[PDB]
Each structure stands twice: as structure tokens, then as C-alpha cells.
Design a protein around this ligand. Structure first.
Ligand SMILES: Nc1ncnc2c1ncn2[C@H]1C[C@H](O)[C@@H](COP(=O)(O)OP(=O)(O)OP(=O)(O)O)O1
Ligand SMILES: Nc1ncnc2c1ncn2[C@H]1C[C@H](O)[C@@H](COP(=O)(O)OP(=O)(O)OP(=O)(O)O)O1
Ligand SMILES: Nc1ncnc2c1ncn2[C@H]1C[C@H](O)[C@@H](COP(=O)(O)OP(=O)(O)OP(=O)(O)O)O1
Ligand SMILES: Nc1ncnc2c1ncn2[C@H]1C[C@H](O)[C@@H](COP(=O)(O)OP(=O)(O)OP(=O)(O)O)O1
Ligand SMILES: Cc1cn([C@H]2C[C@H](O)[C@@H](COP(=O)(O)OP(=O)(O)OP(=O)(O)O)O2)c(=O)[nH]c1=O
Ligand SMILES: Cc1cn([C@H]2C[C@H](O)[C@@H](COP(=O)(O)OP(=O)(O)OP(=O)(O)O)O2)c(=O)[nH]c1=O
Ligand SMILES: [Mg+2]
Ligand SMILES: [Mg+2]
Ligand SMILES: [Mg+2]
Ligand SMILES: [Zn+2]
Ligand SMILES: [Zn+2]
Lengths: 698, 699
């Protein structure tokens, strides 16, 4: 009956079931119409029984079982005996194939490297065949094979810290109740982040940190007020309590900030965590925001090194803090100084984001985002969601192999979108194989909003479009340049073509989301591990191509060509169209600047201009420092990294260089990057005219 | 639920699990490890059955899920024995009208670490020299922790020089931090240092004299609070205020240390093995630090007041300081008495006994290891900053069995095995020497080993001149004595002399090796963390069941008195005091079993006072298990599949709370159950004092 579908490892096919009975039977006896009048009744019975019970969907293993009982029911044993011995023998064949026992760096990093090599080796065989071939050939790119599909792994998530900190939780070998202070709250925040980072292969974010940290500031205030009433005179109670509470808040901030920058995971790297704030109204939230900004401004240790993680993310709201008469303008000035001195934080626009996605929430992960979602109770919830997995297309390759023909380009585009849909469905189904006991921090103690049991299934946290899945892309500029040359931003035809590409991607994602009941959204791939393999594996097959492959990298998604130097206003006006057109699952814009430490007004003007147009902005200032000769400014890039342009100094021990790589920053000296990423960073040019040097040097 | 015939029955999760019990039954009798694994598979099927169906469920599709679930969980052996048994019954169940016929419950990082360890072990087994590798595989000796070494030039233990490297500052992760200006910051830095160090090694770690180097930071907090009081509070109360707040802050500085250490884990996926020592403080700050540590351990962990497992607090007893009732620190000793009675921790050390046994006084190293008196070139004696290097274990019962009652043949094989072990130890030290300071900047580059070295330098500077201790393991003195003189040799002077001669020969061989190779070689009573789970099983295959050698399915741990016998602790300690004096000074610990004495610490105080002069390291075990379903605390009956409450029969770890001392570090059964070999050791333990083993029954 049409009312029932079928789920593969597609519509129900009585012929497909009828073929299974026949092909097994022919192992021992020839086909003869003397017994086929019975086998047809056998296949009809197994169809009429499936229809009577299951109405939504059926797995393949249940199709096999529902036949085996029916074969035994109709007094048949000759072929059923042969039926089982092949189905079982094949079942261990696929499991034994995907078996581990099928045989100047930190020690944990080496052990994780070997484990990841083994995991990639088993997962490549675990993957379905055609998607594996596409990934190997380079048509598409699976993401982070070193952990999936070998183990059920979620890409990145928005940790619900409010839920845990409300009613306590359990971590490690201990279980704890709700914190009764602010320093305790920050310590638990850091410990929880560290524990979560080892149970997933991506970043994490703490949205509205001040909003859910305010009650513990109130608790500290009450404790200090009681202590003052006991000890100090009845005239200076309020002043002493407020001063002690402020000092405790700032101290807790320092602790957390430093705790994140120290703890690592099995990978041996600092977790890719980030924080967001800016919606505070009362006094405690304002003090918390001031403490965060000040502790980021101060530095990292005795040398006042630039902090890399967590990635702070500000929030600009009209009426809250946008204009000089706004009640939180001082916080905005502090954030401006922090941005011009430490390249952080990134500013978010309340109205633009709430219009684009559906509800304001901090970008969880590197640059990912979530649409507005409500549960059965009608209350909107943002913290507690997650992204299962990501794969990325190869738009420049499709553009290049099209030989300048648009219709053929669209045909191969549809083919690749189908391949990517199959990959995404497999990734979702593999993730759905997780169990709460696999990670009690995530699925058992409120990391996802709900607290299930080992008796329950994890799919309750993913269905009804609660959990998003991102399909990535890269190199829209190269795609347009294939057909319209290097300079096409002044042409409406190429811009319309790119917008149509994004719109087709969005429409396919919407159709898939409606079909599979998971929010399939497009995604701006951050080129974390994409261009390094993509450029070389495409230049091996297509050769050197002018302005498309000779750069030795791929332009990230839809941003303006980094080789060009337009004014930031022009760049933002050009770029505002893509997120509006459907590129809403993840996006971030960049703006280069000279040293603006003595002139932060330009950044304020840019933020005010970008508030209405874009919903996400990032600054790129030359804040590199060389302690040997007290140099401050930019660094000249070479194939061996960077060096100070006064002494040739290059060792990471006495130099400080950070550059924005993929949403996050990174220090290339302490961790060298791939050559493609290095070429991409070097090719970057400044946007507004100014001297990129603060202190000349000794 | 729809039965095969029909009708309606309730869905019981026990019926699903009981079948899987018979599944693995045909292949292997129920074991504690397989108990959780079997119920791990039983947890997936119960989750899936209710997911697919809503109103009715019959049997011939649940049998499909469990058939599928076993395959999906890599357990083919149970599945291979399931399907054939499953398929057999339905065929016979069929009846014609006339004539018929004629793995998934572990953490992600845990699984990844398991895979990495398997790869490392496979590489290391071929990295070894031939004869030592063959001896290890044959069960002749044990090369400890092949998972991490010699694949990586690891290190066994490390006495983190917390004082100096905290005072001078250090760089961890991506952040360089200076000296702390508060005790809370100091304890946070200590916790992160411990976590990083444990991540950079395959063994335990400890912090000795924590109060001694934590006093200055408490003084700094006191000074800051005094400065604040001089500006806020009135005059006559000022100093008093500066006390109270400080007394609170120190408490917090310990409270975090109780949780952070418990929470943070290494790449292995388990809490790092770590311990703390104290007791030598004299001034007010050190006294308050010790009181805070004891109080936070007493209070418990979390809302359920669960017993803490780590770190292992280790008290220190000194005559004229904290021993006699007239001593200035007798209240601290009484608090330690209560805490040890109610929490199995801390253990004790004798200042004079230890300082005369191992040259100087130092906290025991990691699990049970020890160091020896040592002075650097400048002549200043240094204790913290040294490190152990590696451990291998001898199979004494194998030598005893191959002797067949001939002492001279026993000595011949003993010398042969000593030569093999010396070759193994030299190879392990040489492999470790191949490390580079950049391999772990926390250890070799930032003061965690004492000296600080640059990248372009060799690690041998931190190991040579007998600085780094290197230890050789042994186990089963009671078994080798009973092979010759019967299982009741405790009253025979000749057998005791024979065992002491064995220990003396080992000590002399270690001394000669240390003289030759310029590394301190010391015999070390290895803890049976997994040795008896492997040594005994491999021995019982080659030699069969022997009379009170292998029938017990375990090996007696080093020189300890026979576990089956129950002598009063005074005679037990009198008997056991001779072995460490004979030369077994590299590592040891003396256990002591008591009934529930919560309202009677006087017996424990008397035992400690008696053992201060004779024994240098004592650990008391008292049943402190407690379950919350029926609210009973006391002892537990060691059933085959772990443990259960004697009253309500509860087993679930989410409600029960049982702690047992498993070779130095008290473990957590029902959390990570141990091998069946060790479970027999715990079950066979007795109580060395007459008294009730229960405290308060259930409801
Ligand atoms: N579209 C379908 N409708 C109903 N049953 C199906 C359908 N496809 C497969 N089945 C059932 C019939 C058999 O009992 C069982 C195996 O059929 P099969 O086509 O081999 O699936 P499959 O996923 O293994 O494809 P293949 O074997 O080519 O990899 O699955
Ligand atoms: N040799 C055989 N003897 C009896 N029945 C068989 C035999 N081969 C196949 N069948 C039946 C049972 C199988 O479920 C069905 C489909 O065949 P087949 O695709 O080869 O196995 P499978 O569907 O379980 O996995 P896969 O197709 O991917 O190998 O036809
Ligand atoms: N009433 C039930 N509730 C839940 N599961 C059941 C129930 N009855 C049987 N099962 C499941 C548990 C096992 O996975 C599988 C086989 O168990 P089994 O005890 O042999 O069933 P059964 O019907 O044969 O009982 P019996 O042999 O006493 O009649 O069926
Ligand atoms: N000896 C065994 N070895 C391995 N698995 C077994 C063994 N005995 C039983 N099992 C498994 C498979 C059985 O389906 C299940 C329940 O046992 P059993 O009751 O004997 O068969 P059954 O319940 O499926 O049919 P029935 O109720 O008619 O006996 O447990
Ligand atoms: C990681 C961590 C957890 N916790 C847990 C332990 C407790 O279960 C929970 C309660 O935190 P607290 O607020 O410290 O509870 P308290 O009873 O000690 O109150 P006060 O400090 O004012 O005397 O927080 C800490 O206290 N400190 C830490 O560093
Ligand atoms: C991980 C961690 C580091 N640190 C670092 C920060 C400093 O570099 C060093 C000294 O500790 P601090 O006492 O914080 O130094 P300070 O200059 O901020 O003085 P105060 O807090 O009294 O105002 O320890 C912490 O303070 N807390 C932490 O949790
Ligand atoms: Mg098939
Ligand atoms: Mg039965
Ligand atoms: Mg507290
Ligand atoms: Zn310079
Ligand atoms: Zn009970």
C-alpha cells in the first residue's frame, strides 16, 4: 500500500521482495511454475502483514526478519534454511570489514594522530560506495573523517549552561548541585566546556553568558552584604558589598579566561570554544561584561600576550547600545578599544540576525547558525541545539569542467547536489546510532536541553528539525570568474548568476528539510581543512588556470576577492546580498584595517554602517608584536611564516603573531598551517588606507 | 506483549536481559566485566523496541533487534552462538498438519584511547629485544604498561616540584602564567599542572608537603585581607576580620582542589592517579590548610555526600609534633583519625621509620613507589622533582613451581630470571633516554622535574647520577614459601628466613646493577592492578590447578600476610615489618582490615601508635559502603557479578556507593569493574578485628 514507505540501509516494491524469495530458491532447485503459485502467495502475505502493522517507515533489517517468520509460517523449510545461512554470513562480513583489529610533538598529539589515522581508514570503508568515491576523487569533501563515521560524533553544539547550572549535574566521578557563587560558576563553566570538547569534533559556544551568570552575581552580592552587616559599620555597607562583588566578578572572569586557554582534549589542542554577551540590562550583567572586556584587554600573562580562545562575540542592539545617548554606550566604547587592540570581539546585529535566521542567537561553532525553533510548548529555545555533520561541495570544479557551458554546469550541479544529499542522509543516520551512555555529559545531563535515560533513544534530540545539518560550498568568485573573467563585480549578470546558485542551493536544502524532517541548511565552509586538499587535487587534474588555480588556494565561499582592495562600505554593500538570498546557515564578513589603536572612530563608523546591512562583522588589525626589539604592527609573510621587519626574528618564544584563519584566530608560529592557507593569508591586502605600523622598533 | 500463542503479557526489561545471560553462558561463566557489557547490549534493545512500536509488540521481531544489536555492538561471539540457538528452536517449534520434517557503553575518548593503546602495544612488542619479548609473552615476566611504552618515551611517575615551579612561573598550553598572588589561584594552577602532567605520562603523580609550599600564598591572602580591613572595617575588630575571611578562603582553596582533580581526566578517559601529602606544617597557615583538607574530605562529594576516590590524601606522623596527646597538633591528628575512620583515607607515614629506611623522608611515590636519600652537586638535599622511570615484574610462583621442591634449582632459575630482568630494565631505561625536551614541555622544560632545560639539550641530565629511580617488581612471596614449607609456614622460622633471603638476594642484585649503570635500581613490591589477572591465568594453563597456589585464582600481593587467614593486626605488622628492612625499600604499603568502627576511633589510634615505630606506611580499610534506596551503610556481600546491598539487593551505581581498596588506590566497583582475577581478591578478604561489619540497617 502507498501509505507505507521504506528506509534503506525509495518506495515499497513487491517485486523487490518477490525477487528475494525467488533468487534464494534457485540455489537448489530449478524455477518451475508448479510451485510459483505458492511463492506469489508468500510474497503477498509478507506485504499484507507489513501494511497492517507499520504505517510510517521500515528498516531493511525488519524487512528481512518479517519475511523469515512468514517463510516458516507457510510450512516451508527447504529454502528458509538456506535463507538464513547467507543473510547471517553476510552480516558478519560487513562488520568484520569495518573492524579495527583487522590490522618534536606532544605525546598525546601523536597518539591521537595514530587513532585518527585508524579511524579514517575504517570510516572510508564504512562509508557508502559512491559518496566515498566522490570524496576520494574530490567532487565533494566529507568533514573530519578522523572521528566519523567511526564513532557517533556531533559537529558542534550550543551548550545549555543555564539548564545545568539551575539544578546541578554530574561530571567525571562526581556529581554537583547548583553553584552558590560566581567563581564556582565560572569554574564549572570551564570544566563543562573542557568535558564537552572531548565528546565532539567541533567548537562550542556560551550564548548570553552575562544573562545566565547574573543570578550568581546576585548571590555573591547577598553573601557580601551579610558579611558587611556582620562586620562593617552601618554606613559603608553598600559600597563595600558592591566593591567586593565587582572584585569577585573580575577575579572569576580572569580564572575562566585563563582556564580555557590551558585545558585541552584528547586531540591535544585548545578547544574551539567561544562566548557571547551584550544583552545585559541590570548592574550585575553590565559589570560582568565590563570584566570580560577588561580581562581580554589586559593580556595573557606577564608578557601581555594576545588571547586566542575563547572567541568573544559582542552584540549590537538599537536602543540598548548603538548610539551615544544609549544606556550602555560605555560598554560599546570598551568593546571598541578591545577590538582595536586585540582583534576581538566580533560584533553581531540583533535585528539583522533575527530577520535572517528567525531568532537571535550567538553563532555556535566557527561560523554556523540556527533558524528560529519552537517546541510543542510554544517557547522559543536556542541554547541546547547542535549540528550533526557537514559536507562541502566543489563549485569551482563544476564550473571548470563545464567548459564554459551554463546548462551543462547546472546538470552536473544537480548531480553533485544529489550525491551530497545522499552523503548528508548517511551522516544523519550514522549519528542517530549514538547512545546516551556513549557521552553522559551530552545526552544525559542537560547539554542538549533534555535529560534522557539509557532506556531512551537519542533521536528525541534531533527530530522535528531541532538539530540542523549543514551542506557547505566554496569559491563562488571562481565560479563566476570562469564565465565572466577576473573583474565581474561591476557586472549585474555574474552577480545574478551567483545569487541564482545560492538560491538553488537554498531551495534544494528546503526540499530536503521538508522530506527528512531535519533542518538541512546551506553553510559557508570556513576552509578549515578544505582548500589545502581542494586546490592541489584540482590542479593535478585540470592544470594551472589563470586567476582560478594559480593562486594556490580557493576564495572562501562568497567573500570579495582578497587580492582586491575595496573600501569596507563597498565590500559590505556587495556582500550583503548572499546571506539574504539564502546563505543563512553560516556566514561571517571580514574587514581589514591598519593599526587603529590611536583612532577607533573609523571602526565605530563601520559598525554603525554595517548594523543595518550585515549581521556579522569581523576585524583584521595588524596587532602583531615582537618583544626582542619592541616592535608593534604587521609582519611580512614568507613561505616560512612571518618575521619582524626590523630584526628578522621568527622564533615563537619571543614573538607574538596571530592571524584570523577561519572565524577564529591562530598563531602560525606555535602551529604551522598548510601552504594553501598560508598563501591565502599572505595574499590578503588592507581595505582602508593607513600605516600598518604602530611602533617602528629599536 | 504478544506471545507466540497469543494473549497479552506485560513488557519486562528483565526477561530481555535474562536470555542474553544464557547467551554468554554457553561460552563463558558470568564475570564482572561481562556483566556490564551484557547489560550494555541489553540497554540498546529495550530502547529500540519501544521506539518502533506503540501499542503491541510480539516476539519474532524483538529477537531480530537483539540479533541485530549484538552484531551492531561488535560482539560476534555471542551473536554467533545466539543465531544458531535462535534458529534451532523455531524449526522444531514448527508443526505441520500431518507430518513435519521427517563496546558500545564506553566513552568516545575511551574507545579512541583503547585503539591507540592496541596499536602502541602491537608496535612495542616488535620494538622489544627478542629474549625479553619472548619472556613477557610466555608469562615469565611482565613488562608493565606496554600500551604507552616503548612506543613513546614515557615516564612512570613524577614528583612535580610544585614549590619552585609555582614560585618562578611557567607556561602551560598557550598561556604563560606568573607566580600566584592568592591561594585559590595557586590551587587552580596546581590542578591544571596535575592534569597536564598526568596527560604527559602513563602513571601516577603526587604533591608532597602541600602545606609547606602553600603557606606563603595563604600569608599573601592574609596580608591582602588585612590591607582591605585597614580601609573598610573598624580598628578593634580589624585583625579578627583578617583571620575569618582568610580561614574561609583557604577552605575554598581546598574545596576546588577536591573537585578539579576529581573532574579533569587525561586522554585515557579516566581520572588521573594522584595523591597529596602533608603533616609537617607548624605555623598557623599550615595548620589551617591541613584542617581544611581534612574537613573537605570529611564532608563528601556533592549532594549525596559520596566518598571521594581521588586524590589520595596521605598523612604524616612525627614524634613530638602530632603523635602524643601533649603534641601541639594533636587536634589535627584526631581530625585525621575521624576522617580515616569514616572515609578510608588518609594513610599514615612514620617520619623516623621512613627516614631510616629510605635515607630521607618523602611522600610515597604515586601508587606505592618510594625514593631514596639523594643530594645534588651543590650538596642541598632535594626530594621533590625526581621521577621514576619504569617497572617490570617477576613471576616468583613460576620459579617455585619449576623448582619442584629443589632449592638449588630454584636459585638457578632465579639467577636466570634476574639476568633477563636486568636486560629488560636496561633496555627500558635506554629507550626512555631517547626522549626530547620538546616532547613534553610541561615536564622537561618548565620545572616539573626540578631543573629547566632548553630544547637543544639531552634529557639524561635529569636522570643520571642516580637521580631517577628505576624499580624491579616481584609478587607472590607467600606462594613460593608455601610451595616448599606448606600453606601454614607463618610460624616456621626457616620459611621466613628463606623469604628474607630471597628479598636480600634481590636487594644485592639491585645494588650491583645500580653501581654498574649509575641508575638507582631498587626492588619494588608491585601492586596487583592487573598482574594477578594475567600472571595467575597464564600459570594455571601451564601447571594446572595446584594446592593453594592457583586454585584461589589469584596471587598474594608481594610479601603481604595471607589474605585468607585473619590474624590480629599487631602480629600481622610484627610479621610484615621484616621485609622492608631486609631491602624491599623501593615501594610498599601495609594493609589493615577493620569492622565498622565509626563510633570508635580509639582502636585505630592505638594501631597507629603501635605501628609508628615498626611500620613506615600503613593503610586502613574499613567498610564504608552505602546505598540510598534503603539507606544502609556498612559492608557489602561480594556477589559474583560485583556487589549488592545485603538488605534490598540493590546494584545500580546511580543509587549504590561502594568503595574498595584495590592495590593502593581505592577503586570504584560498578563504575569500571575490574578483571575477575582481582574480584576474587576482594571477596576473599577478611576482617582483622572482632566487631560488627554493619553500621545501620535498611528500612
Ligand atoms: N524498494 C524496496 N521495497 C521493498 N523491499 C526492498 C526494497 N529494496 C530492498 N528491499 C528488501 C528486499 C530484500 O528482502 C532486502 C534486500 O534487497 P536488496 O535490493 O539487496 O537491498 P540492498 O540495500 O542490499 O541492495 P544491494 O543488495 O544491491 O546492495 O531488502
Ligand atoms: N546465497 C544465497 N542463499 C540464500 N539466499 C540468498 C542468497 N543470496 C542472497 N539471498 C537472499 C537473502 C538476502 O537478504 C537477499 C539479498 O541478497 P544480498 O544483497 O546478496 O544480501 P543482503 O541483501 O543481506 O546484503 P548485500 O546485498 O548488500 O550483500 O537475497
Ligand atoms: N513477556 C516478555 N516481556 C519482554 N520480553 C519477552 C517476554 N517474553 C519473551 N521475551 C523476549 C525476551 C528474550 O529476548 C526473548 C526470549 O525469551 P523467552 O523467555 O524464551 O520467551 P518465552 O516466551 O519462550 O518464555 P517461556 O519459554 O517461559 O515461554 O523473548
Ligand atoms: N544455551 C544457550 N546458548 C546461547 N544462547 C541461548 C542458550 N539458551 C538460550 N539461549 C538464547 C536463545 C533463546 O532464544 C533465548 C531463550 O532461550 P529459550 O527459552 O531456550 O529459547 P526460546 O525462548 O527462544 O524458545 P522457547 O521458549 O520455546 O524455549 O536465549
Ligand atoms: C569545579 C568546582 C565545583 N564545586 C561544586 C561543589 C559543590 O557541589 C557546588 C557548590 O559550590 P559552593 O558555592 O562553593 O558551595 P558551598 O557550600 O561551599 O558554599 P560557600 O562556598 O559559600 O561556602 O559547587 C565547587 O564548589 N568548586 C569548584 O571548583
Ligand atoms: C588558570 C588561572 C591563572 N591565573 C593567573 C593569572 C595570573 O597570571 C597569576 C596570578 O594570579 P592573580 O592573583 O589573578 O594575579 P593578579 O595580578 O590578577 O592579582 P589579583 O587577582 O589579586 O587582582 O595567576 C589566575 O589568577 N586564576 C586562574 O584560574
Ligand atoms: Mg542486498
Ligand atoms: Mg523461552
Ligand atoms: Mg564553597
Ligand atoms: Zn623585531
Ligand atoms: Zn540497600
Amino acid at each position: 500500500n502507498p501509505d507505507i514507505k521504506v528506509i534503506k540501509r525509495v518506495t515499497f516494491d513487491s517485486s523487490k521482495i518477490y525477487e528475494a524469495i525467488l533468487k534464494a530458491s534457485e540455489t537448489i532447485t530449478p524455477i518451475t511454475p508448479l510451485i510459483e503459485t505458492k511463492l506469489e502467495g508468500i510474497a503477498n502475505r509478507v506485504v499484507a502483514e507489513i501494511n497492517d502493522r507499520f504505517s510510517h517507515n521500515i528498516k531493511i533489517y525488519e524487512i528481512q526478519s518479517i519475511v523469515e517468520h512468514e517463510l516458516l509460517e507457510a510450512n516451508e523449510y527447504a529454502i528458509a534454511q538456506e535463507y538464513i545461512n547467507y543473510r547471517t554470513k553476510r552480516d558478519f562480513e560487513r562488520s568484520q570489514a569495518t573492524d579495527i583489529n583487522f590490522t618534536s610533538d606532544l605525546y598525546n598529539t601523536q597518539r591521537d594522530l595514530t587513532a585518527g589515522i585508524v579511524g579514517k581508514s575504517v570510516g572510508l570503508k564504512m562509508l557508502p560506495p559512491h559518496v566515498a568515491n566522490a570524496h576520494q576523487k574530490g567532487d565533494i569533501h566529507f568533514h573530519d573523517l578522523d572521528y566519523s563515521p567511526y564513532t557517533p560524533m556531533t559537529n558542534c553544539c550550543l551548550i545549555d549552561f543555564k539548564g545545568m547550572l539551575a539544578n546541578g549535574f554530574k561530571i567525571g566521578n562526581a556529581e554537583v548541585e547548583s553553584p552558590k557563587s560566581i567563581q564556582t560558576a565560572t569554574a564549572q563553566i570551564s570544566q563543562i566546556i573542557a568535558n564537552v570538547a572531548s565528546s565532539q569534533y567541533g567548537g562550542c559556544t556560551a550564548d548570553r553568558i552575562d544573562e545566565f551568570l547574573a543570578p550568581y552575581a546576585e548571590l555573591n552580592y547577598k553573601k557580601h552584604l551579610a558579611d558587611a552587616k556582620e562586620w562593617v559599620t552601618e554606613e559603608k555597607q553598600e559600597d563595600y558589598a558592591r566593591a567586593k562583588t565587582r572584585k569577585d566578578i573580575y577575579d572569576a572572569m580572569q580564572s575562566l579566561e585563563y582556564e580555557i586557554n590551558t585545558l585541552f582534549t584528547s586531540n591535544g589542542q585548545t578547544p574551539f570554544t567561544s562566548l557571547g554577551f551584550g544583552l545585559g540590562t541590570n548592574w550585575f550583567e553590565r559589570e560582568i561584561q565590563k570584566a570580560i572586556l577588561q580581562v581580554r584587554i589586559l593580556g595573557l600573562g606577564s608578557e601581555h600576550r594576545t588571547a586566542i580562545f575563547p572567541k568573544l562575540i559582542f552584540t549590537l542592539k538599537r536602543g540598548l547600545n548603538l548610539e551615544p545617548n544609549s544606556p550602555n554606550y560605555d560598554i560599546k566604547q570598551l568593546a571598541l578599544e578591545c577590538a582595536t587592540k586585540r582583534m576581538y570581539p566580533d560584533v553581531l546585529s540583533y535585528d539583522k540576525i533575527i530577520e535572517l535566521t528567525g531568532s537571535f542567537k550567538a553563532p555556535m561553532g566557527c561560523r554556523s547558525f540556527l533558524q528560529g525553533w519552537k517546541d510543542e510548548n510554544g517557547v522559543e529555545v536556542n541554547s541546547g541545539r547542535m549540528n550533526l555533520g557537514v559536507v562541502t561541495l566543489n563549485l569551482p570544479r563544476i564550473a571548470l569542467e563545464s567548459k564554459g557551458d551554463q546548462d551543462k554546469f547546472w546538470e552536473i550541479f544537480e548531480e553533485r547536489m544529489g550525491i551530497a544529499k545522499d552523503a548528508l542522509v548517511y551522516r544523519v543516520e550514522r549519528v542517530k546510532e549514538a547512545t546516551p551512555a556513549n557521552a553522559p555529559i551530552l545526552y544525559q545531563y542537560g547539554a542538549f536541553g533534555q535529560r534522557l535515560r539509557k532506556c531512551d533513544s537519542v533521536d528525541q534530540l534531533f527530530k522535528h528539525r531541532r538539530a540542523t545539518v549543514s551542506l557547505g560550498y566554496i569559491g563562488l568568485y571562481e565560479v563566476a570568474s570562469v564565465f565572466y573573467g577576473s573583474d565581474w563585480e561591476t557586472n549585474l549578470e555574474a552577480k545574478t548568476f551567483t545569487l541564482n546558485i545560492v538560491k538553488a542551493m537554498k531551495n534544494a536544502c528546503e526540499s530536503w528539510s521538508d522530506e527528512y524532517d531535519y533542518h538541512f541548511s546551506v553553510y559557508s565552509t570556513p576552509s578549515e581543512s578544505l582548500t589545502d586538499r581542494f586546490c592541489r587535487l584540482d590542479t593535478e587534474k585540470f592544470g594551472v588556470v589563470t586567476d582560478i588555480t594559480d593562486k594556490e588556494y580557493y576564495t572562501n565561499s562568497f567573500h570579495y576577492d582578497v587580492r582586491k582592495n575595496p573600501t569596507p562600505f563597498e565590500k559590505l554593500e556587495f556582500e550583503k546580498d548572499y546571506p539574504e538570498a539564502g546563505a543563512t546557515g553560516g556566514f561571517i564578513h571580514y574587514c581589514e584595517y591598519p593599526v587603529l589603536q590611536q583612532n577607533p572612530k573609523a571602526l565605530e563608523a563601520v559598525w554603525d554602517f554595517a548594523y543595518d546591512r550585515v549581521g556579522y562583522l569581523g576585524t583584521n588589525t595588524p596587532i602583531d608584536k615582537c618583544y626582542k626589539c619592541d616592535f608593534e604592527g604587521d609582519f611580512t609573510p614568507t613561505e616560512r611564516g612571518f618575521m619582524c621587519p626590523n630584526c628578522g626574528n621568527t622564533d615563537p618564544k619571543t614573538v607574538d603573531v596571530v592571524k584570523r584563519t577561519c572565524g577564529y584566530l591562530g598563531n602560525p608560529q606555535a602551529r604551522p598551517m598548510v601552504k594553501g592557507r598560508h598563501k591565502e593569508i599572505s595574499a590578503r591586502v588592507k581595505h582602508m588606507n593607513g600605516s600598518t605600523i604602530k611602533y617602528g622598533g629599536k
